[PDB]
Design a protein around this nucleic acid. Structure first.
Length: 133
RNA sequence: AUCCUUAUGCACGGGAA
RNA sequence: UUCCCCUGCAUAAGGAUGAACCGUUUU
C-alpha cells in the first residue's frame, strides 16, 4: 500500500480561520501527516498523506481556495488587532508517493526553534521535506 | 451535515356513514 | 369504529450540493 503525498510551505499562519480549515479538512479527508511552524508568528510546513482524490482536493484547497494574501483581524483579550497578511504565501515543495508513512494521525504543532521542528520531522523521517529558513 | 420526492407508524384538528 | 384532507415527529429508498475563530490529534 503506497500513499500519495504532498508537501507545502507557508510564510505565516496566524489566521485561525485558516488553521481551522487545515485541521478540519485533514480529518475529514482521512489524510495523515502534519502541519508545523516555528513560533506562532512563524513560517512552516504542511504534509498530507492519503489517497489521490483527497490530496488533490486538499491541494486545490490550500492553493486555490484559501487566500493567504488577505489581511485579517485578530480578536483579542485587549481588543481587535489589524493583522497584516499581505506578505504571506503558500507553495508546494513536494509531491509523490510514499511506501509507508510513520505518520499516525494528523496534527498541527508550533515549534520553538527550527531544530525542534527538524527533530519533530525526524520522529517520522520527513526532515528531508524541509527547505530551512 | 442540508434540501426535495415516495412509502410506513404514532399524536392533534376539520368533514361523512 | 371506518373512510377522506391538513400539520408535527421517527425510520427506509432515490437525486443534487455548501459553510463553519481553530493548534500532538475526540474518523
Amino acid at each position: 500500500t503506497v500513499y500519495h503525498c504532498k508537501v507545502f510551505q507557508f510564510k505565516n499562519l496566524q489566521n485561525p480561520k485558516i488553521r481551522f480549515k487545515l485541521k478540519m479538512n485533514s480529518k475529514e479527508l482521512s489524510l495523515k501527516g502534519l502541519c508545523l511552524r516555528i513560533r506562532d508568528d512563524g513560517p512552516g510546513i504542511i504534509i498530507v498523506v492519503g489517497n489521490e482524490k483527497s490530496c488533490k482536493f486538499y491541494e486545490n484547497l490550500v492553493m486555490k481556495r484559501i487566500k493567504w494574501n488577505e489581511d485579517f483581524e485578530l480578536h483579542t483579550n485587549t481588543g481587535d488587532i489589524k493583522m497584516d497578511m499581505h506578505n504571506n504565501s503558500i507553495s508546494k515543495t513536494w509531491e509523490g508517493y510514499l511506501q509507508d508513512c510513520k505518520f499516525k494521525g494528523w496534527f498541527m504543532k508550533v515549534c520553538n526553534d527550527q531544530d525542534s521542528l527538524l527533530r519533530t520531522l525526524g520522529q517520522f523521517d520527513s526532515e528531508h521535506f524541509y527547505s530551512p529558513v
